[PDB]
Amino acid sequence: GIVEQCCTSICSLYQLENYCN
Amino acid sequence: FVNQHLCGSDLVEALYLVCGERGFFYTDK
């Protein structure tokens, strides 16, 4: 999921940027 | 945004540099 890949570790930058809205 | 665990803060932090603002967001979904 989100935190699962962003908090527990590091997610993809472009994917982390898609977090916008 | 280096690779060393991010979580909310880092997100909103990176998100603050990857998007700047424009009302960005980041949830568990």
Side-chain angles (χ1 to χ4, degrees), chain B:
Chain B
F1 37 90
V2 80
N3 314 332
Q4 217 185 145
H5 290 99
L6 330 161
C7 303
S9 33
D10 304 43
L11 262 29
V12 13
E13 290 241 70
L15 272 65
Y16 259 133
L17 299 153
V18 321
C19 227
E21 36 153 351
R22 194 64 156 280
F24 83 78
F25 218 50
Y26 58 109
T27 23
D28 211 332
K29 194 138 128 170

Side-chain angles (χ1 to χ4, degrees), chain A residues 1-13 16-21, chain B residues 1 3-7 11 14-15 18-19 22-29:
Chain A
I2 299 297
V3 141
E4 284 214 88
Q5 218 159 336
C6 285
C7 187
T8 325
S9 79
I10 310 76
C11 26
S12 253
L13 171 279
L16 157 158
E17 169 265 357
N18 241 106
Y19 288 7
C20 224
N21 216 330
Chain B
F1 37 90
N3 314 332
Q4 217 185 145
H5 290 99
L6 330 161
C7 303
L11 262 29
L15 272 65
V18 321
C19 227
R22 194 64 156 280
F24 83 78
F25 218 50
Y26 58 109
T27 23
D28 211 332
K29 194 138 128 170

